Amino acid sequence: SVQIVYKPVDLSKVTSKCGSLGNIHHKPGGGQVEVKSEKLDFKDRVQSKIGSLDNITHVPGGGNKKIETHKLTFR
Amino acid sequence: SVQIVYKPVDLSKVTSKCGSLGNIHHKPGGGQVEVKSEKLDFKDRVQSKIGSLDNITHVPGGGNKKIETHKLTFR
Amino acid sequence: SVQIVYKPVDLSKVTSKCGSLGNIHHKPGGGQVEVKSEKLDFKDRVQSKIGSLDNITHVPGGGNKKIETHKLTFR
Amino acid sequence: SVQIVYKPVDLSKVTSKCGSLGNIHHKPGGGQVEVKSEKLDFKDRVQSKIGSLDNITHVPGGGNKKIETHKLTFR
Amino acid sequence: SVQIVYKPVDLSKVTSKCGSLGNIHHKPGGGQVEVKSEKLDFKDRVQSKIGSLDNITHVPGGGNKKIETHKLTFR
Amino acid sequence: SVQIVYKPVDLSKVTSKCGSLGNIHHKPGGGQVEVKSEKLDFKDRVQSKIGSLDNITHVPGGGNKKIETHKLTFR
């Protein structure tokens, strides 16, 4: 007789206190950009990105993360 | 007779206190950028990124992380 | 008769106190960039990144990390 | 013949640049205050101030000051 | 014949540049205060100040000051 | 014939550059204060200040000062 008891207890705390969060300045691509292209031959696929792209300002008040995985495999 | 008892107890704390968080300046790509391209032959795929791209300012009040994995495998 | 008792107890603390966090300046790529390319032959795949890319300013109030793995394997 | 010419020229500049101003915490009188007074005789004027009074948080973006006095006295 | 020419020229500059100003903590009077007064006789004026009073947090972005006095006295 | 020419020229500069100004902690009067007064006779004026008073946190981005006095006295 196989008897399995899976009783994990979790009283965890993931906490953050922040007095003030601010005055954040993200200024990407203030510089001049000049692309002068002449007599260019392309045989296959071309991907071009010019300028200021995919810039992120991520400012969460908390941004606390808890990942918990529970796995009971029986064969 | 196989008898398995899986009772892990977790009273953990992941904590942060911050008096003040601020005055953050991220200024990427203030410089001038000049790309002068002439008589260039391309046979295969081309990927070009010019300027200020994928710059991140990440400012979480906490940013505390708890990863917990539980695995009970029985064969 | 096989009898397994798995009762780990965790009363751990991962803590940080910070009086003030700030005045952070990240200024990448203030310099001028000039790429002059002439008479270049490419047979295979080309990847080009020019300028200020993938620069990170990561400022968490805490940034405390707890990784806990529990594994009970029975064969 | 008295001939007075009063032509002062003022091309002055009083300037300030501030990237960010913030995260200012003024917490006066966090402590407990207990005044136990017994059998006190007062013949003249009494002024009593108890607690947290006249506390100032003054945070100007500039706060630049120019005082200019011009005085031409003739007797 | 009295001939007075008063032509002062002022091309002065009073300037300040500040990248970031912040994370200022003023915490006066965190301590406990206990005043136990018994059998006190006062004949004249009494002024009493108890606790946390007249505390200043002054944080100007500039706070630049120019005082200029011009005085032409003729007798 | 009295002939006075007062032509002072001022091309002065009072300048300050500051990369970052911050993380300033002023904590006066964290200590306990106990005043136990018994059988005190006062004939004249009394001034009493108990606790945390007149504490200053002065943080100017510049705080540059130019004083200029011009005086032409004629008798």
Swiss-Prot record, chains A, B, C, D, E, F:
**Which residue ranges contain the repeat Tau/MAP?**
2-32, 33-64
User: Can you tell which superkingdom this protein's organism belongs to?
Assistant: Eukaryota
PTM: Phosphorylation at serine and threonine residues in S-P or T-P motifs by proline-directed protein kinases (PDPK1, CDK1, CDK5, GSK3, MAPK) (only 2-3 sites per protein in interphase, seven-fold increase in mitosis, and in the form associated with paired helical filaments (PHF-tau)), and at serine residues in K-X-G-S motifs by MAP/microtubule affinity-regulating kinase (MARK1, MARK2, MARK3 or MARK4), causing detachment from microtubules, and their disassembly. Phosphorylation decreases with age. Polyubiquitinated. Requires functional TRAF6 and may provoke SQSTM1-dependent degradation by the proteasome. PHF-tau can be modified by three different forms of polyubiquitination. 'Lys-48'-linked polyubiquitination is the major form, 'Lys-6'-linked and 'Lys-11'-linked polyubiquitination also occur.
Residues modified as Omega-N-methylarginine: R45
* N6-acetyllysine, modified sites: K7, K13, K17, K27, K39, K43, K65
The entry annotates sugar attachment on K43, K49, K65
Chain residue numbers at which the record places covalent cross-link Glycyl lysine isopeptide (Lys-Gly) (interchain with G-Cter in ubiquitin): K7, K13, K17, K27, K39, K43, K49, K65, K71
Q: Which residues form a coiled coil?
A: none
Q: What's the reported outcome of changing V33M?
A: In FTD1; ultrastructural and biochemical characteristics indistinguishable from Alzheimer disease; accelerates aggregation of tau into filaments
Annotated positions of the Phosphoserine modification: S1, S20, S48, S52
Q: In which tissues is it expressed?
A: Expressed in neurons. Isoform PNS-tau is expressed in the peripheral nervous system while the others are expressed in the central nervous system.
Q: Where does the record place it?
A: Cytoplasm, Cytosol; Cell membrane; Cytoplasm, Cytoskeleton; Cell projection, Axon
Q: Which residues carry this modification: N6,N6-dimethyllysine?
A: K7
- UniProt-annotated site: Not glycated, residues: K7, K13, K17, K27, K36, K39, K66, K71
Give the protein's biological function.
Answer: Promotes microtubule assembly and stability, and might be involved in the establishment and maintenance of neuronal polarity. The C-terminus binds axonal microtubules while the N-terminus binds neural plasma membrane components, suggesting that tau functions as a linker protein between both. Axonal polarity is predetermined by TAU/MAPT localization (in the neuronal cell) in the domain of the cell body defined by the centrosome. The short isoforms allow plasticity of the cytoskeleton whereas the longer isoforms may preferentially play a role in its stabilization.
Q: Subunit composition?
A: Interacts with MARK1, MARK2, MARK3 and MARK4. Interacts with PSMC2 through SQSTM1. Interacts with SQSTM1 when polyubiquitinated. Interacts with FKBP4. Binds to CSNK1D. Interacts with SGK1. Interacts with PIN1. Interacts with LRRK2. Interacts with LRP1, leading to endocytosis; this interaction is reduced in the presence of LRPAP1/RAP.
Per the entry's comment, what about the domains?
Answer: The tau/MAP repeat binds to tubulin. Type I isoforms contain 3 repeats while type II isoforms contain 4 repeats.
Q: Which disease is it linked to?
A: In Alzheimer disease, the neuronal cytoskeleton in the brain is progressively disrupted and replaced by tangles of paired helical filaments (PHF) and straight filaments, mainly composed of hyperphosphorylated forms of TAU (PHF-TAU or AD P-TAU). O-GlcNAcylation is greatly reduced in Alzheimer disease brain cerebral cortex leading to an increase in TAU/MAPT phosphorylations. Frontotemporal dementia 1: A form of dementia characterized by pathologic finding of frontotemporal lobar degeneration, presenile dementia with behavioral changes, deterioration of cognitive capacities and loss of memory. In some cases, parkinsonian symptoms are prominent. Neuropathological changes include frontotemporal atrophy often associated with atrophy of the basal ganglia, substantia nigra, amygdala. In most cases, protein tau deposits are found in glial cells and/or neurons.
Protein name, UniProt field: Microtubule-associated protein tau
Species, as recorded: Homo sapiens
Q: Taxonomic lineage of this organism?
A: Eukaryota, Metazoa, Chordata, Craniata, Vertebrata
The range of the complete sequence contained here reads: 622 to 696 of 758
